[PDB]
Amino acid sequence: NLAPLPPHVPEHLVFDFDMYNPSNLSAGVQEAWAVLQESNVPDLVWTRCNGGHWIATRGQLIREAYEDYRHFSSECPFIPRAYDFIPTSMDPPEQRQFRALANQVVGMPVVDKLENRIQELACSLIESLRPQGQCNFTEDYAEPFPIRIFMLLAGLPEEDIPHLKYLTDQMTRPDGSMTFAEAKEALYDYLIPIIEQRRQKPGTDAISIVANGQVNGRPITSDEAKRMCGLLLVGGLDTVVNFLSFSMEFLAKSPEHRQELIERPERIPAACEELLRRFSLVADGRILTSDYEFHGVQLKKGDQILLPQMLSGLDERENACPMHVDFSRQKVSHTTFGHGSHLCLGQHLARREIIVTLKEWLTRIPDFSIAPGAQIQHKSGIVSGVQALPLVWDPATTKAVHH
Template sequence: MSEAATLARPPAGVPQDRIVDFDIYNPFHGQHDLHVAWTQLRDSTPHEVVWTPYNEGHWIALSPDLINQVYSDATRFSSRVVLVPKSTAGEAYGDFIPLSLDPPEHRPFRKVLNDKLYGSAIHPLEPKVRKLTVDLIESFVANGRCDFVHEFAEELPLRVFMQLVDLPVEHLPKLKHLADQFTRPDGSITPAQATEAFKAYVHPIIEERKAKGGNDLLTHIATSEVNGRPMTESEAARLAIQVLVGGLDTVVNFMSFTMRLLAQAPEVQARLAANHDLHHAAINECLRRLPLVSSAREVVADVEVDGVTLARGDMIVAPTELYALNPEMNADPLKYDLDRKVRNHMAFGSGNHTCPGQFLARMEMKVLLEEWFARIPRFELEPGQTLRHRGGIVGGCEPFVLRWDVG
């Protein structure tokens, strides 16, 4: 554990065997695999819910049923605060909407996002996504190697997202740094400072888009109505910031987890290169095997769960990793199996706040597999690397190098 001064005191009455040495931002004990770290925690205790003194102290849901309840039952687990530590990252992020709103208040704001991110609204983007994907792969394919995180994963989804919101690519480093302060803070600035920086960036853009018009997502937010009235400037800015934070991290990391896994599975590569009809199953199996979000909720009122009392105002983290990686939900859950008949997962969350960007993420992954395997049918991890994952609200991969035979 860290120094005792940095750790919270357990709530009164919490049994000692419920207290675990687990920091979601640094969950690793003797290894550096995010999913193994979570399963080690689950396997270390018979309980469905445990308490950790890290990050101001909070509960962690371990069973699939409880994880699902935390995401789905807003009457007991509120989205008012979704990050830990509660008093810093949690309260700062709670200024953004619609994730910090519970039903029914969140619905009109969520509809604004759905209008631009669901189903048919995403289809027109595919040609642009495909061209950018091809251009990126062609830029390094002849080299026989690439740093996948830096040369592809941090390029494709972020550039596509910047097109979606019609913002200059040159603004990406600043925006990505601010977004990371909520999911994996590095201490360079506080979450409150990141929030203020986002507001300073977004407010003039919202004013400009209201006057100028256009078809991009930020203009749609700036000019939309909720409950039969125009959104206030504050509401539009808070919704826009939520979009920016959500769009600048998750797909980058999911692509990185996926390609690192496939690099270690030559038999899967051979099948995907030979049969594009398997790509859909491959994406779904990656979503099942590689979930990476561990969001939190605030307890609405004192409630007994698995023999302990969660008090009003307590925070509980619900790792989507442990929903899919439980043998009750999927047989042999750590195995990557293209032929799996049933895939139970919560990679995009559950309930009212299921990720609105899932259609764009799936399309980007589909295009990646199609264009990658058309040019690089066999690849591997370059030997001698130290491979590490990152913890956090959204898990990630440290950069790694892939290599392949040229020609």
Template sequence: MNSVNPAITPEGALPDNVPQDRVFDIDLFKLDQVEDGYQEAMMKLQKPEIPSIIWTPRNGGHWIVTRAQAVQEVLQNPDPFSSQVIVLPKEAGEKYDFIPTRLDPPEHKAYRKVINNVLDPRQMRNIEDSVRQTSIDLIEAFAAKGKCDFTTEYAEQFPVRVFMAMVDLPLSDAPILMEFAGQILRPAGTTPAEMAVSLERAIKGFYDYLDPILNERRGKDGDDMISRIINSEINGEPMIHSEALNIIANLLLAGLDTVVSFLSFVMIFLGRNPDHVKQLRDDPSMIPRAAEELLRRFPIVADARMVARDTEYEGVTLKKGDMIQVPTVYSGLDESLNDDPWTVDFHRRRPLHNTFGDGPHRCAGMHLARMEIAITLKEWIARIPEFRLGSNAKPEYASGMVATVKCVPLEWDV
């Protein structure tokens, strides 16, 4: 993983601002040894001999930061680390036009305000009962069986049902929307050009799906998330149609993928660690703290930033237009930020992480995500107080902008 590959970086092929000793042959979309665990494979790059910023020739060539401090600095500083392109490879990322994620301050502020208004803590409290009932219904459907495939029977159902209700879209449409989301976050293809085609096709799929829905809800008094956004104002003016498409497609992308993946990572851990389950069973009041510790331990997002101007950073020269990938795993599992970071400690006083990002683009959906995680833990343990990962389980991990894991069989005594 950490050796220079002459076949990929022949003599003279490197950009002139990339020192040879910063080149590592790493493909974070097809990560070596990911079958042993996503976080475990990623953290092979956080070693004393590996610099805090390295360069890979894969996926069009880009930088990668490998330390908590660098993750935070890049995410917190839109100048020089712009969100104009946040998806790799760059050739694909230039097709990604969702807002406000691709806007820098101050332009993004008005759009972010609209999103905050529909995802703030008060709004989450208003839907908490219905979210809880969704979780209960799913768990009770298989609790008496003594087993389930957690990924397909819960993780791919619960956050999706919650979000589809929030936007008032038919649940039957979720599979195609989830397919679009997957092709944006983990685009198919072996070259940047092929990945760009996959991503552009998925974005068009979102827009074609949403266009008639937005037209139908504009000017009406619906209380769903789409209606509230499409009828919002930006700087005192009605939101234009293309901007509403961008924002709502962005929300669908986030709402239908990330928590789905994260929950499966959590249940693999709990299924292997009955003592941690017992702690939550004995004291359910610690569930919110436990959820935060699990967020720290299992980060799965690795989006990117584009260098807005030539700048010196961590001993290298970054050129305008360079791309930098920012894996959040290098924050929560960095021992400079958290003592004994591999250990899940529900009594950790202050779990520090950037699992929801940082800076102006810190995840607007974090209140919803925290609520979904806490509700899942509480309602699951109330109904299935002891469980284990299946004896023949072989979780299937995949890396990308958002890592995933599938095939999570859980068992319990009935």
């Protein structure tokens, strides 16, 4: 149920919100967190669920905290207090350095070069769906898409997907075959030999670049390698799947917006940016490194604070009618990719993945809707998401474009 209030918390601040299971889930997952952005609700509140933690409800305080790395540690970004990826729990000499490395394998220039093959892939995935007049978009496009793209990026064989995809599935959605420990170990088991192999040789692929990286002028350890690769892989899975989904959920609910883009495809940039704001999905936190008064509140050492990336951007103080999707919104503001020293390294890849998805989809399937009489179901978490997206469309009205 709820863990006991610690002595330093004013009752007028309590407000019990289960991030794993919010009251209004049925409304939709954002809408459900937006309860924390009602007027009567304090800017920074405390809930007793999940062990008891804080929660900043407004943009300014969120930004401010990820800016404040000295006070707000990334030792335990997850509520509740398991895992060991690089570079999340690491400080600050090494930190910037590892981030550089990765940025080297997923930065803009890399994405720019890949766009082409990314296009090809989305196109084959859509085409194989196009005739059917329906699908579970979530299972049939969104899930197969980001895994494949990592394979492209890391130059790995298509034939590894099933098993690889199995391991990452176990990390976030165990069926019970493997503990979180086991699925990670096995990930590494599969990775190590390719690292060594490619440390020897030097390729252009993502694993090669990472494998031959210096850190403190010293060569990167194998142990370090598999970890970065590790997060590069799983970091770009659920978030994209899930996000692609909200975005398809809304386009399918809205022919107007769907039209805006069929007519003027150059709007897709800002569009995509605006959906990233509207359907932000990640809810991470940090841990206090010692007592600290913050915006008029006494935080205790060891404390944990949810700092919901989802929130900024839905905060009225930062965008007007935050709940309205306007592709022509002048200033789109969000921390959908986080803030401060840990900002999302994949952020560039992600955008392109979205943008391609959207362009290559609509240019081929202009007309689609939710399957008659299905209630789309959201789930809440560190990464929020969509259970399924049953879609339908008359095939006559599609078009096949080739490569």
